[PDB]
Curated annotation (Swiss-Prot):
The lineage of its organism: Eukaryota, Viridiplantae, Streptophyta, Embryophyta, Tracheophyta. One of its GO terms (biological process) is brassinosteroid mediated signaling pathway. This is Serine/threonine-protein kinase BSK8. Probable serine/threonine kinase that acts as a positive regulator of brassinosteroid (BR) signaling downstream of the receptor kinase BRI1. Functions redundantly with BSK3, BSK4, BSK6 and BSK7. Involved in the regulation of sucrose-phosphate synthase 1 (SPS1) in the context of sucrose resuply after starvation. Activates BSL2, a phosphatase that may dephosphorylate SPS1, leading to the activation of SPS1. Keywords: ATP-binding, Brassinosteroid signaling pathway, Cell membrane, Kinase, Lipoprotein, Membrane, Myristate, Nucleotide-binding, Phosphoprotein, Serine/threonine-protein kinase, Transferase. Coiled coil: none annotated. GO terms for cellular component: plasma membrane; plastid. It is found in: Cell membrane. Its EC number is 2.7.11.1.
């Protein structure tokens, strides 16, 4: 059950917000900063530490956090609690010991991620988004490979932290505008449809092994240019038909017009027929112990 924590408890768990406990990607001075910790009950946790002045009203911070804390699903790294003592604003979530999609996808050492695993990530994250939407949290902020985490069983999960903005005014987003939906600059707001656009960018990341701005992915996607768009590391692992189908899905998600993008249920239905090696454990497919 979602609960409150004291700041002393969280400082103890994180060894005083020690810099080497940072597990997020932007270092100590960023709008998004996350620390690993360990509670006295031996539970490992992830602690997002919001910047000063980001959520100045404790009541509105607590109410958002509580709302997110109602969500409980096995495709999410779930929200366990919050802290709002002494001007701090913290979210406490389940710790994900097998690190991020970005690590495995962009910074692989032994070999590139398998096709079947990339498809499993895409499906499970779509399912997570469908779940969030069903529980009234249809907005997700800065969806990218750093928000996809792998649990103890190496299963991919969506970080709960993105269900809240980095700041109450929404101006502390991390996403470079090259990757934001076209309507976001105009409106300054995330909508359910803009989340789908961001899912498109995740699909492009998975297909390519690269972080390619959608505008650049444009002619490549038009030409279904497998050589240019697809990760060379995948060669041999997928049929041209299946690769093309995932490209087409990404195209749908990246449509300029928000109303033309698929809804979360359509993402799931499009992803299911493409799944491979369903009977193989994520530990094995991902190549982690």
């Amino acid at each position: 059950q979602f609960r409150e924590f004291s700041i002393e408890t969280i400082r103890n768990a994180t060894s005083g917000f020690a810099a080497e406990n940072i597990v997020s990607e932007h270092g100590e001075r960023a709008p998004n900063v996350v620390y690993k910790g360990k509670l006295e009950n031996q539970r490992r946790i992830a602690v997002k530490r919001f910047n000063r002045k980001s959520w100045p009203d404790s009541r509105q911070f607590l109410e958002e956090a509580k709302a997110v804390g109602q969500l409980r699903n096995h495709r999410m790294a779930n929200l366990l609690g919050c802290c709002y003592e002494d001007e701090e604003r913290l979210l406490i979530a389940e710790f994900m010991p097998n690190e991020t999609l970005a690590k495995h996808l962009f910074h692989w050492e032994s070999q590139p991620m398998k096709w079947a695993m990339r498809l499993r990530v895409a499906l499970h994250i779509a399912q997570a988004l469908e779940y969030c939407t069903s529980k009234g949290r249809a907005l997700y902020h800065d969806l990218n490979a750093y928000r996809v985490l792998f649990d103890d069983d190496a299963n991919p999960r969506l970080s709960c932290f993105g269900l809240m903005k980095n700041s109450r005014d929404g101006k502390s987003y991390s996403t470079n505008l090259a990757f934001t939906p076209p309507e976001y600059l105009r409106t300054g707001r995330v909508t359910p449809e803009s989340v789908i656009y961001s899912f498109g960018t995740l699909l492009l990341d998975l297909l390519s092994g690269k972080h390619i701005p959608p505008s650049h992915a444009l002619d490549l996607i038009r030409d279904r240019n497998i050589q240019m768009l697809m990760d060379s590391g995948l060669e041999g692992q997928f049929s041209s038909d299946d690769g093309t189908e995932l490209i087409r899905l990404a195209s749908r998600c990246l449509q300029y017009e928000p109303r033309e993008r698929p809804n979360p249920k359509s993402l799931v239905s499009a992803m299911i027929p493409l799944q491979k090696d369903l009977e193989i454990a994520s530990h094995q497919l991902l190549g982690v112990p």
